[PDB]
Amino acid sequence: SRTPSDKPVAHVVANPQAEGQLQWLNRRANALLANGVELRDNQLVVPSEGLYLIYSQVLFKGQGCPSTHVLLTHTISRIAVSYQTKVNLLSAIKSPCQRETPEGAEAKPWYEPIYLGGVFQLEKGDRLSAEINRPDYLDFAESGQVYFGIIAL
Amino acid sequence: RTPSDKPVAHVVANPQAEGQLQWLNRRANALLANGVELRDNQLVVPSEGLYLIYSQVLFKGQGCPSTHVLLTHTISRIAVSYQTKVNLLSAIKSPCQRETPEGAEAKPWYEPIYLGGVFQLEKGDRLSAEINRPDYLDFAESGQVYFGIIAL
Amino acid sequence: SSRTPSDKPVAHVVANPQAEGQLQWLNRRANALLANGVELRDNQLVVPSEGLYLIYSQVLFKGQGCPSTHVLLTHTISRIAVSYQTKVNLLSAIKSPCQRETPEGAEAKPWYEPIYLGGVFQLEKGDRLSAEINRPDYLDFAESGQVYFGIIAL
Amino acid sequence: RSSSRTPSDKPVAHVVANPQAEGQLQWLNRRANALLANGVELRDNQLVVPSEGLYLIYSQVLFKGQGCPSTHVLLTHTISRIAVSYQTKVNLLSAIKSPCQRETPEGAEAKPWYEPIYLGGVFQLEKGDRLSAEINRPDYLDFAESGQVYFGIIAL
Amino acid sequence: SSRTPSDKPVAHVVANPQAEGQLQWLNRRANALLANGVELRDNQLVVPSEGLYLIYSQVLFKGQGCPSTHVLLTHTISRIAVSYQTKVNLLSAIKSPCQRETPEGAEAKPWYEPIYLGGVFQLEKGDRLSAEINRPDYLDFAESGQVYFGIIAL
Amino acid sequence: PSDKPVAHVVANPQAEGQLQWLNRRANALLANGVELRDNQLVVPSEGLYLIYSQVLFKGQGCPSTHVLLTHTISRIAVSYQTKVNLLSAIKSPCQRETPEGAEAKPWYEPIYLGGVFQLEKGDRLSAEINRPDYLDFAESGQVYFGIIAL
Amino acid sequence: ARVDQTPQTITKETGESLTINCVLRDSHCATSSTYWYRKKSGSTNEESISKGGRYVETVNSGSKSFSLRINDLTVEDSGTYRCASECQYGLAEYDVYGGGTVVTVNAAAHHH
Amino acid sequence: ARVDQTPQTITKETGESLTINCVLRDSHCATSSTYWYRKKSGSTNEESISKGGRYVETVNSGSKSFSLRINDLTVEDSGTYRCASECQYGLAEYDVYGGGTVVTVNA
Amino acid sequence: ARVDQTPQTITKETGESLTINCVLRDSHCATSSTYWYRKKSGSTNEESISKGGRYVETVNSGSKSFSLRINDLTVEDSGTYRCASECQYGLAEYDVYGGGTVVTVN
Amino acid sequence: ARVDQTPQTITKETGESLTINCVLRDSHCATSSTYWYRKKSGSTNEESISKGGRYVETVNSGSKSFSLRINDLTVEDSGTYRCASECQYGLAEYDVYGGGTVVTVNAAAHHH
Amino acid sequence: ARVDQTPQTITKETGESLTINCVLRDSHCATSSTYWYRKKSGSTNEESISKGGRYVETVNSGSKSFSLRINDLTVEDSGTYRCASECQYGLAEYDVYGGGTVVTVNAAAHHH
Ligand SMILES: [Cl-]
């Protein structure tokens, strides 16, 4: 360690060895978590009140979606000390299969990424969480395909 | 209790805005302070410096017609130095590959677009986040469509 | 005219429109920046000083018809550091633009796919960042700010 | 303290330029003596035809500048159509005008030039066609008074 | 004698050529119309029924040489309504025929500049439309249908 | 199924120094009885029509004296078989200052005419200009001509 | 759930008095900058209810709840009533809303 | 015309009450859909004045007039206040505005 | 871009076969009323290419594309070839063209 | 439209002088560092035209316009010509371009 | 004539802001040594306007013109205002002047 550098910061990436779950990690190469940011239950805990930049990306992969009725979601939520209800700050939905379902052929690997980012005023003790409804379609194979992070502006 | 900061803005789509994109600031988890004004659906930069501009839109439709809709989303800039609307960020997305479902109707599709970048803005510059088809907006749930700038 | 000085390492490079089958990054164009020490060498950004940076890039893919079998669109920002001289992926995304529908006696139709990547990272002096795509033949830089790549020292 | 029992018609629109739109051409409909009714919708500064049929398209713009410091300035005004059958911008009506033919106000100034441009024609439009009236130099617009810049269609 | 009936409020009036320096609207000339209720009062058209109308007018200005630099020719169609008793412009145009010049050493330079106006509007009963110009001393109503003004109920 | 006679003809761009009207072009109409005979539109039914035409003039310099650009829509009727002007306009493009041994300055001047008239069966309308050497048919919809029975 | 309007469905008689209570759950909103809005049955216009006379408002800042007692009820007072509050913390300023429907019946006016 | 603000320039002291009157001249605009907007002196953030508390709105349908009483004037209640109305006749629907400046001096 | 002729400039050898493809983008144009025209190098007169024998035309209505394969190539064939189609929707009847030049050496 | 090259298509004969004019619309670009590029018909080289002799460059800062007069025109001077200018405000430095093509025919050389 | 003041006579009201512009005609005078002078109505001494606060000075180097915007107008700022500039070529040093008069009217006059 040479130069100090500061601000609450976090850039966590999904655990590749979790398969059917999205577990956030910080001890893996180009990942960061320092200066007060806590990771409790896959939740980032704000250490100080101020303006933050919140972002997250998720990559979905399925092997030839046979079901027209497929819905993929990705949302970053906030539970604050002032108002103790989970509300979505950033949200996105994506329909991966436009009915087109493989009939007389073989599998069709589809990939769908979703990216979210925004600036918010957060308070001390706020709990941020990035979650998806289909954690069985997670593709954490490669490296920077799924992540979640904040930086104090 | 905690002191303010720097020019910032995070505006959200109006949920009760019938088929149109009106940006709002006086709603939960939204900001517009430290000089940034929202004029006629436009953000006005109050001071010279480097800003980070971003916006997301969620498009939803209840079926794939034959028209072949093209979804566009661009953040453009009108500067005091060059009084022409020029695009800073843009993206295009075609939602329908389907050969118009003739028996399996409805089937709601969802398509998002996210834009973000760093730019140098001048005093009085007007940024505008716009889309070509404001009739496919999904401003139903919170924070699905938004637009913001922050002075870095 | 002159108002405020401004500072910190920043870069926002945009693809060259007069380039064919290539993603060549340019800095000497209207709303593009490359100042405060950031160097653009071999289609690569060279970090001039250690700190926390914000990295982002967008790519727009377009084709006028659906091709055969499955084509995969890739977009990754990589980093080769002085500390570890091997290129590792910081951000990645894959996207399938053509879902079956291999045109066999049917009309072609232009598809568009954007891909965006962004995150905060700690970079050192002399690190070489590069944003690249696997199929530079589907690039749609026919309009402005549709493909770009940038960093800013926070 | 009055009464009204007035009827209606067929797709029509007559929109007027925004006066408080700094150096830009924003089309408005919620202003006196302006129309946008019977299905014609205004999206992204574009009119969307609500039904297929025979239409009359017209538009005027007024250009004003406060001096001629360039014998090489071009003012153009075009009504273009991007159609559902052919998703390409094609010109329906166009006109070009050179506002400054002289050798620039080299001595005294305050010579405001005014040059108007008018377009009109009948066309066959389909449902979902998007019509757009545009100019090349939106910095010379004279929207100071009323009914100086306008754009409209009417279903014949 | 007459032939097929035809209807709708209609008007196409032409300037009086024998009026020297003024704009008098006439209907008793070959290709001019004024029928089905449209009244021309004090050089003003009175709408006979509520509905949508098409308004148009052309004025041709001619001068023999340019005297003033600050010469502005205007042409407007105005409306004073029963609901709002103030004359407001529906269509307007301004034109400067002379860019400085002011011929000192020359032999007179006759200029011709026309102005055309048109639009569709909703009019009420008793509204008065009026076509007016600021300088009726430059009117060129010589050869033919060079100056005219009309409405038609669409 | 749209009735009422209509016509909207546009100039031929590959026509050497002449104003030839075309109807089998992208955004052009000639239907419900209006025929284009000898470069003239023939009205098929008696009634009220809206007549319009625009011409765009372009030149690469101001030659000697003044050029008068005229644009006129004429009507020759079965009742009175002489060509008479329904709409006319004149414009002088050159404000003197002929190029004094220097370089050119391309001028553009368009002219538009429009109005409502009563036409009878067999009337022949023609939109015409005096200098077909200044026609700018380079782009589309810069010179056109049409009627519609309202 | 960010202000809680309690009386959802009410059916009262002409000549009565309904009191509607709203409770703040966001600790940044104040009971001082409160507003009330009604939407009369059959119309799509949200009108601004006035502070005075027949519409009396009782506020208690301790529990962060405010109420609105309405007297002399007729049959034209059937509509959707919402409550509002002005919140302010850091650089943030926002407002909150609720929801609730009213139905009023009549007394028939017995004729001898 | 098109709505007429009567008190054009007023100058009152902190702690008082000014009334602004607007009169309809268009018989298609209604005294029912009236709106108010304020612009604080030296700032172009024209906001929508809310009807309640210090801002009371009186409507009289007979004379086609609406007014806006402002109570407890402060030194920050100095600006430019405009009124608005929604008009609708046949196929046309539009809105109209006025103009008039307020300056409050503090004691 | 209403009809899209694909092989813009081709340079072939005597005795081969060039295929020129045109795809309709105006959904009002029909693959049934297709025409071909040639401009022989040095002459400025167009002519109607005949469908038969050495000029074979393949049309596919599904893909809205038609092509013209010319076999047994000689040196008198160097010229600019255009394709055409007759479109008809409502009250409109028009035609569309393209462009593409061929050079054959011996 | 960030500098506007005005004579788009010009057609001169061997032995002439064509003027190409560009006017700046970006208030950040300066008339001091101007460059010209010509691309000879059929090749994609866009070599840089030099300021001197047959290529005379006239600059006027008042109207923010520059031109490039080419005299003694031959048939080897036919190509697409672009103008350029160097812009710089805060941390940004860029350049701007235009467009315009020339076609030159000969004089037929009447042989006695 | 060297130096041309554009606003000759102005009559603004108390509480407003006037800008007076001057244009240089001699190519020996510089927009760098510009000065402004006011002469209060009723007195003879011409005072030197200090650029700061209410007196802001703008410059445009392309056309060699400078202006002077005066904000927060009072009624005691009525007078004859002149602009000045310092010219210097070879063995010569001189200055140039203009002219332009101001009348500012006040308020009250509440006609009862
Ligand atoms: Cl009536």
From Swiss-Prot, chain A:
Disulfide bonds join C65-C97. Changing S82F: Biologically inactive. Residues 8-153 form the THD domain. It comes from the Eukaryota. Changing R28W: Biologically inactive. It is found in: Secreted. Changing V87 to A/D: Biologically inactive. Residues 1-153 are extracellular. This is Tumor necrosis factor, soluble form. It comes from Homo sapiens.
From Swiss-Prot, chains C, E:
It comes from the Eukaryota. Glycans are attached at S1. Disulfide bonds join C66-C98. Residues 9-154 form the THD domain. Residues 1-154 are extracellular. Changing R29W: Biologically inactive. This is Tumor necrosis factor, soluble form. The lineage of its organism: Eukaryota, Metazoa, Chordata, Craniata, Vertebrata. The gene is TNF.
